[model samples]
Target: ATGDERFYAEHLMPTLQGLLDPESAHRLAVRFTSLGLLPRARFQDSDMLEVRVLGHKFRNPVGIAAGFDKHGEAVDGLYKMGFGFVEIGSVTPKPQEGNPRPRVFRLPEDQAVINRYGFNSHGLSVVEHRLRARQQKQAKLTEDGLPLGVNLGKNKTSVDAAEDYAEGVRVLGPLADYLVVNVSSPNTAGLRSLQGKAELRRLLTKVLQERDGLRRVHRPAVLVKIAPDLTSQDKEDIASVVKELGIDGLIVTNTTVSRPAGLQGALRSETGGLSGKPLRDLSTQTIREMYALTQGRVPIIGVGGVSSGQDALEKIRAGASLVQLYTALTFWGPPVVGKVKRELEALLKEQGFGGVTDAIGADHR
Candidate 1:
C-alpha cells in the first residue's frame, strides 16, 4: 500500500503502455497473467467496500470487465489483483479468430479503447477446464471467494443466435457463478438487434430454459449485458422483458457505437465500440435511466469509463450495485485496481454511507 502503488502506477504503467502495438501488448499482458507473473496488491480489505448482490457477497464492488479476459485464461490472477469479481468472456459457441488484426485501438489521449474483437474465444471446453481446475476450497476462503462470471456470446456465422446463447447456458452455466447473455457487442453484425423486445425475450427464455435443463446443484444467476446505444422505447422493451422473466441483474452497458463529440484526433474516427472516458457519461446516464425504468427492481453492474473511486461512486449513486472497468486497466496498469477500492472506501466514509450497498441509487432518491 505504501510505495507499491506509486511504483506500479508511475513506473510499470508507462513501460507497459509504451508498446506501440496495443493488441500485442494486450497479448503479452494476458500471457503474463496466465503465467502468474503479476504482483499482488496487499491493501486492507474494508467492510465499506463489500457488496452483496445476486445473493453473493463481493469482497469489493470493483471488478474486471469482460473484454479484458475474453479467453478466461487469467481468472485467479485477476481475482488476486483485488477485483471483487472477475467476468471472463463474450465467449462464442465456437472458436473464432475475431474481426482480424487491428481490431483493438488505444485512445490514450481520451483515456479510452475501441475494439471490434467480434467475440473471439477458445470456445467453451477450454474455459470450463480452467474453471474446473481452480481449487474450490481455496477459492471459497479467498476474500469472500471471488465470484467468476462467464459472458456468453454468439458465433459470427451462426444463424440462430438464441441457440448459441442457449448452448452457452447448457455448457458453461454449470461452472460459472453467474452467466451474462451478451447481446450487446457491436462488433458482430445483427448482434445489437437481439436487444429488440421479441428477440431479447426469445434469447433469454431459451438461455434460462437451458439453465433449468442443466440440473446442476447450484443454479447460476443469469443476467443480460446490453449496449449503451438503446433508444427510449428500446430500453423500455428490454426492461419489460428481463423484468418479466425475473432475470437476476443487468450490466448497464457494453461499449458505445456512438462517438462523443470531444473524442481525440484520428483514433476517434475508428469504426468500433468506443469505451473509456467518452463512454463514462453516456453509460452512467443509461444506468440512471434504466434505474428509473425498472424502478430499481433490477440490480445493475455499472461499467463504462470508470477509472477511479470517484467514477465508481458516481455509478453506484446513479444506481449500480457493483461496478467494473477495463479500458482504465490499459492506461493505469494493475495498481488502478487497488487504488479504486481504497479510494471508494474512503469516499463511502466521507459521504456517511454505511456500506457500498447504502449508496446505491442514492441519486434517484
Candidate 2:
C-alpha cells in the first residue's frame, strides 16, 4: 500500500464518515474511486489464494458484492483494490428512484447498515453502456482474468418479474463473467416471494434461457442471490430448484430483515435489510444448511458480516466456495481487502489445508 492509500484509509475515510451521512459518504467514495483516485494494489496475490469457480480462475476468493457498485461505475477502480472479482448492480430493466431519502442508515455501534434502497438503479441501459466502455478500456489496460459479475433485479413497478430478469440477462449477459438473478433484496416488494419453489423455478428458467441465447462464445454463468431470512422448507425448495435448473451458483444471502438480540446501534429498529456483524451467524447458518441440503453440489458465494479473514474462513468451512464483503468496506476502506486475503492465506495454512479449495465444506467432514 502506498502512502496515499494509507492516508485515504486512515484519514480521508474517517473524515468522510464523520462529516457526511452514510449515503452521501457512500456516493462520494464511489465517485472518487470511479475517477481512479484510489491507489491500485501493487502486490501480486499468492498462488495458494487462487481458485476456479463459475468457469473462471479468480486470483483470490475475496470479492466486492453487488450493492456497493449498483450502477457499474467502479469496476476498474474496485479491481484495482485487489479484489479477486467485482460484482455490480441489482440493476432493474428501467431506471428507478428506489425509495426516498433517509432510506439508508448507519449502525456504527453494531457495525451494521440498514438500507431500503429498493434497487435504486440507473437501469440496464446505463449499466450496459458503462460495462461496454469498461471492456473496451480493459483491452488496453490488460487487466484480464479479473472476473466481473452483474446482478439483475426487477423494477418495483414491473409486473412481469421473469421478463425483467430475462431482459437483464439478454442485455448484460455477454459482458459479464457471471450473472445474478437477484430475487432476494428485502427492499423490493414481492421480490423475496419469488424464492418460492415454483416462482424460483420459473424465474431461473427464464434467466437461463436468455443466458444460453446470448450469441457470445462464452455464456455467463447464472447465479441466484437468496435472502438470509428463510424457512426450512424455503431452503429445501431453493436447493431443489437450483439443482433442477442447473444454476451456476448461489449467493448465500442478501441481508436480513430479522434483527438479532442485543443490537446496540440507534438505527437498529430501521425497517430494511440488516448487514454486517449482526448478520454474521445467521448468514453462516444458512450457508451451512444450504450446503447440506444441496449436498455441496452448488457453489455458494458466502456473504454477510464478513469483516475479517476469520469470518470468511467460517463461511468457507461451512460451505462457501468464495466469499464477498460490502459492509466491511464501508467501515474499513480498501485495506480490509488485503488484510482479509493475508489472514485467510495464513489461516488456511494453519488449518493444514493445501489451498482454499480444500477448505470448502470442511466442517461437514
Candidate 3:
C-alpha cells in the first residue's frame, strides 16, 4: 500500500473522532508507528530537494516537528514515513505527567488544535536508553538516514528553570544529532518568562557549558525553540542571544496563546497554545522577523500552520532554512509528509531554484 493507503487505514478507523479521545488517538498513533505496522513511503531522490544545515545533510527540508513523539518511541518509524528528521522529547530530567486529560482539543471547523500538555515526558534516563539502542544500529543505517533531534523542556515544580534545561542538555545531548532548548512552551507556568533577556543568557550559558563538558561527546547542533507570541523587543533580544551564544539554529516557533478574530471552532474558547492553520500567518511573520533580526546569519526551522507544499515554500521565502509540521499532521494524516515534500520539490523547480538552499529567504532578498 502507498502513503495514502496507510493514511486511510490508520485515521479512517471506525468512529475516529467519536471513539478515541484526542490524546488517546495520538497515543494510538505512537503505538502503531513504534511497532512498524504503518505503511511508510520510500522517498525518491530529487536533486533539488536536498538541504545542508548545521553541518548535516537532509534528504529534504520538510521535517516533522516535535509534540508528535513526545517520547523516543517512534523515531525510526517516523523516519520511515518520509520525514528528513524526527525530533523527540521536550523531555525533562524526571518523569512527569502532563496537564489533565481533555487538555488537547481539536477545532475541525477552524482546522486547528489547542493543547496545554506541559512538557509531559518519560524523563532522560528512559529516553537516553532508547537513543542508545538506535545508536547501536547506526552503522547499518542508510547514507541518507534521518537525523534525530532532542527537544528539551523544564520540570514544572522546579524553582530554577536554567538548571532544568542545562541538565537536559547534559543528559540528552550526546544522543541527539541536534538539541532544542525549548523555553517558549506556554502551557508551563513561567516557562515563557525564561525568554527574558537575562534569563535567556543565564539558561543558555549553563546549557552550553554543560554541553562542552561531556567527555568524548560528539557535540550536536544546539537550537533554541521560541514562541511566536513575541514583541519586537523580544525578537531583538532573542536574535542577539542566539548570535552571541553561537547556537546552531532556531526553531522559529512553538504554539501560540493568542486567538485571532473569526475563529469558528467550539474548542476555540479552550485555554492553551493554539496550532494548525490558525497559526500559519503569525508563524510565517515571526520567521520573517527573526530572519531579518539575525540578518540571515542564524538558520531557522519555520513551523506553525504548515500543512501543504505551498506553506513550506512560503516559509522558506520568509527565511526558514527548513520547515516543520505537527498539528497539520493531526488533521491530514501521515501521508501529509510525502505530499508536502513532493509539492515542495515541484514548487522549487517551478520557481527556478536549483536547490532548496537557493530558495532560502528569496522573498527577503
Candidate 4:
C-alpha cells in the first residue's frame, strides 16, 4: 500500500510519536534519552494545526507517547523538537525497580520491540522537581504553553492498587495538563485485569475523586489506557466504564503479548509484549471497535504499529481522534516525525479534507 519515496515523505510521517517504553527496573528511563544531546526540534507553521483536547490546546495532533518522557527531565528539549504534545511518567508514589535485565529487545525484521520494563521511576519528588524547573524555563521561553501530559500508575505489589493509582494522580495532576491511568500494560501480572468493568469503575472513580480534591488550579484531563489483548466483553466493559467515569478520553491500546498470527522468526519467542508493524492492524481494529461502542462520544488516542503517514491516516479513518507511535521511531529517527507530519498534511489535502479532523473516520464507512 506504500508508494514511492515522495509518497512516504508526503503521506507517511505525521502520525509517529517517539517512545522508549521498556520493562526493566531503571527509573527515569525514557525522560533521560540519547536525543537530549540534540537541539530543539520544529515543524513548519503551515503544517501546524491547533487541536483542543480536554480544555487544553495542542499545536498539532502529533505527540510523544507516555514512554518517551518517563520523568519530565527534558521537557524543554522535547518541546523544542516540534512535537505537538508530550506526556511523561507512569510515575507512581514511590521509587520502583522494574523487571530483570535484558528486558528490552529489538526485532528489526518485524519492525517491533518487546519490552518488560516495569514502571521504573525515581519517585514523585524527582519528577516534580524536574517539572517545576521546566515550567520556569517555559515561562521565559515562549507564549505557547508546551502541551504536556503525565501517565500515572500503581506499583506492582501494592495491596491497594486503587490507592496507589490515586496517589499518582494526586501528585502528577497539577503538574500535567492531562493524566493517564495506565491499567493496560501487559508485563505487570494483574494490571490488565483492572480494566474489567467493575474494577475500572471503582479504580477510576477513586482516582478521579482524589484528583478533583487535589487538582485546584490545574485540572488536568484524566484518561484510561486499555490493552488490545482484551476480549469483546472487555471492550464493552471499557466503554461502559468510560461513560460512567466521565473520563476525558481513552488511549486505545498498550503492548500485546499475543504474537502476530503469522510465520515465525527468532524474536517470535521473545518473552515480552510486542509492538511494531505486526501490531498495527490489531490496534487500529480495537480503536475502531471502541469508537463504535462509544459512538464517538469520547476522543480516542490510537497507538501501536504506525510506521508511516499512511498508517496514521488509516488510524484516523479507523476512529482515532489523535494517534501515537513508538517502535517505528526507534528504528527510524526523530526526523521521521517531521517527515510524517508533512506527508500526513499532504494526504489530507489530496484527500479533499479541509482539515485533519475532517478526515478522521472517513474511511471507516
Candidate 5:
C-alpha cells in the first residue's frame, strides 16, 4: 500500500490510519487473522535451522521483536507473515496510561520514529489471558508450531525497579516460549541505570529466582535486552554477568541514543531511542562483542538496526545465532520477510557456504 510522499500525506496516511489505531495496532492484527488475509509465517527449516535457544527450537532464525505486537493479539497474523517467532508485550503487572497521546511521532525526513511511549500496554493479567487463549488456538491449528516470547516490564507507578522486573518474569515467563527482561528501554525514567553490573546482577537474580517458581509445568527461556549507549566496560561487565548467572541468552541491543554521523539532524534530535539504519554498526558491534565474549558458550539474538538481508547476515557472521526486528518491519511491511530470507540464502551461496547456519561467525575473525 505504498505511494508517493504526496499521496502518503494527503491520502494514504489518513486512509490507513483511519482503518486502525496505530497505538492499538495489536487489536488490528487480530482482525487481519480473523479474515484470513494473512501472509507467510513459517520458514523452511532446511539446513538453515531448528536452532535451539533457551530450550526451544526456532523454525528460522528471524523473529518479530517485542514492540510490534504487544498483548499477543497478532501472534497468529505475524507468524503467518513468516516470522520464525514473535515476541509480544512489554506488559506490566498493572495497565498503565503510558506517557501521553503524542508520545509516538514519525520522523519522515529520516525514515525513522521517536516514541516516548513509556511501555504502554495492557496489564499482565489481560495479556496473559490473551496469550493462553492463543496457545490453545495454535495447538489446534499447527502441529510443530511457532515459538512465542513474552517480554515483561515495570509498572510505571512502581518505583522499586528490581521488584518490577522480578514480578514481570514471574508472571509472564511461564506463559511464553521464553521471557525477556527489559531494563534497557530509554523511555522509562532511570531504567537504563539497571544495566550496570552490580545492579544487573541483583536484578536478574531476583527475576531468575521467581522465574523458576512460576513455570512449574513449563519453564520458558530467559534473556535480557541491553542498551546501545554502554561503553566497552559496560559491555564487558554485562557479558561477564551473563556467564556468572548462566542466563540463557542476550538480546544484543534494544535501540540507540547516538545518531549516525549524518541524518536529518532535526528528526534525529527527536528525543527517544533511535532505531533503523543508524543503529546497524552499533548493534552489530555489540553482537560481535558479545559473540567474542562468549566464545560460543552463550547464544545471542541480535535486534537493533536490521533492515535487510545483508544486515541479517552480518549479525549471523558476527555470531548471533538468531535475530529479531521491530523497526524494519514497521516501514517495509510484511513481504520483507521473504525478501530478506531469499537474499540471506543467496548470500550464503555466493559466499560458497553450504548452509546458512554454517556461515555463523565466519566474518568475526
Candidate 6:
C-alpha cells in the first residue's frame, strides 16, 4: 500500500502541475484533503520519533506548516496522511480578499513558491465555527485528538495589531493545541514590523495577557513565527523579547524575501516571500542564531526547504526541537511525511542518539 501510494502521488504531481495554475492546484489539493480522502498512515511511529514540546507529546516531530491548511478544513485528513501535528492559517480577524488574481507563482525548477496572498482568510468567525464542529465530532483515530495549532494574523486594514492578535487568542485559543502569532509573513503589508523589539514586546504582552485570561484547563502554547531575513540586531531583539515574555516556542522562520543567487526558475523574479529549497540553509542558520541568543531556552520549530529526513535532522542539529514542511508536500506529496519520519528515525539511530530530543542541538555541542 505504501509503494502504491507513493506511485500514485508521483504520477499525480505532473498532471496536477500541468493542468492547473499554481493557486488552482493548491485550492484543489486543499479541497480534496477536506473530504478526508487521504489514506491513513499504516505504521505506528517509533518511540524515537516522539517529541515532547508545547506541554504535549507529539507522536512524531514532522508537521504540515501553516498556510497549507489556511482555513482549518483538512486537519483530520492531514493527520491521517501522517503529520504528527497540523498548523493552520494566518487566519485574519476579519475576512480579507488578499491580493488580486495570480498571486501564487511556482518555481518548479527550484522546488519553490512565491506568494503574495496577503492573508486571504475567511475571518475568524467561519474558522471558529468549523473548529468548534471539529472539536465536537473529534475522531478517536489518533492517540490523543488531533494536535492542532492555529496561526493567527491581523486583518489587512486593521489599525491595532495587538488588539487583532489578542482577539485571536481570545476566540481560537481554547480550541487550539497551540497558537501562533504570525508576524513574519512577507506578503502582508507592515506585518513584519511587529517583529521589532519594542513593537514585539508590546504586542506579545497583549497576546500573553489574553492567553493568561483563557479559562480552559489546557491553555494553548503561544509561539511566534519570524522571518528568516533578519539582521543581527533583529535576531538579538527577538530572542530578548521572547525570553522576557516567556513565549513557549518559536517557529524559526516563515518564508524569505531575499532571493538566493543562481535560481533556475522562470518565477525567480516574482515579488513575494520565497519558500522551499532556497530557504533551507538560511533558515537553519537563523535557528542556530536564535537558539544561541536565547541560550537554548527557546524551542524552535525549524521550517523551510525541509524535503527529507536529512533536512529535518540538519535543522534539529542546528537547534530546532521540531520541524515542518509545506513546499515538500508540493514537490513530493503525502509519501514525504512517512519518508521523513523513517529517515529521521534512522538518522537518529545512526548518530547514536536514542531519540529526536537527544539529537537536538548536537551540532552546537
Candidate 6 has a TM-score of: 0.96
lDDT of 6 at 72: 87
**Model 1's TM-score against the true structure:** 0.96
Better of 3 and 6 by TM-score: 6
Which digits, one per residue and each the tens of the lDDT, describe model 2 over residues 105-177? 9898888899999899999999989888767665333245578889999999898999999999888888888
Per-residue lDDT over 1-365 for candidate 3, one digit per residue giving the tens place of the 0 to 100 score: 25474555356742576678789989998988888876567557586878888777777887888889988999888877788888887898899998988799988888889998888999999998888887845423424656778999888898898888888888888887789999999999998988989989888988888887776546778899999999889989999998999888899889999999989998898999999998999999999999999999899999999988899999999999889999866776777788788888888889999988999999998
Model 4 Cα displacement at 335 (Å)?
0.9
Off by over 4 Å in 1: 135-143
Query: Could you tell me how far off, in angstroms, the CA of residue 13 lies in candidate 2 after the best superposition?
Result: 3.6
Which lDDT tens digits does candidate 6 get at residues 1-365?
A: 46945675678786778889989989888987888766556757988888888887788999999998999888878888888889999899889989998899889899898888989999899999998887744434323634788999999889999999999999899888889999999987898989999999999999999999888654789999999998899999999999999999999889999999979999899889999999999999999999999988888999999988899999999999999999987877777888888888889989899999998988989
lDDT of 1 at 283: 92
In model 2, which residue pairs have backbone atoms overlapping below 3 Å?
none
Error of 5 at 115 (Å): 1.4
lDDT of each structure? 0.86, 0.88, 0.85, 0.73, 0.74, 0.88
Q: Model 5: per-residue lDDT, tens digit, 229-329? A: 89889889998998999888888788777767778746567677787767777888888888888776687888877867788889989988888887665
**Residue 107 shift from truth in candidate 3, angstroms:** 0.4
Query: How would you encode candidate 4's per-residue C-alpha lDDT over 80-102 as one tens digit per residue?
Result: 55677777777877888787777
Better of 2 and 6 by TM-score: 6
Cα lDDT, model 1, residue 166: 84
**Candidate 1 structure quality by residue, lDDT tens digits, 79-134:** 77888898999888888888888888888788888888888899987877777787
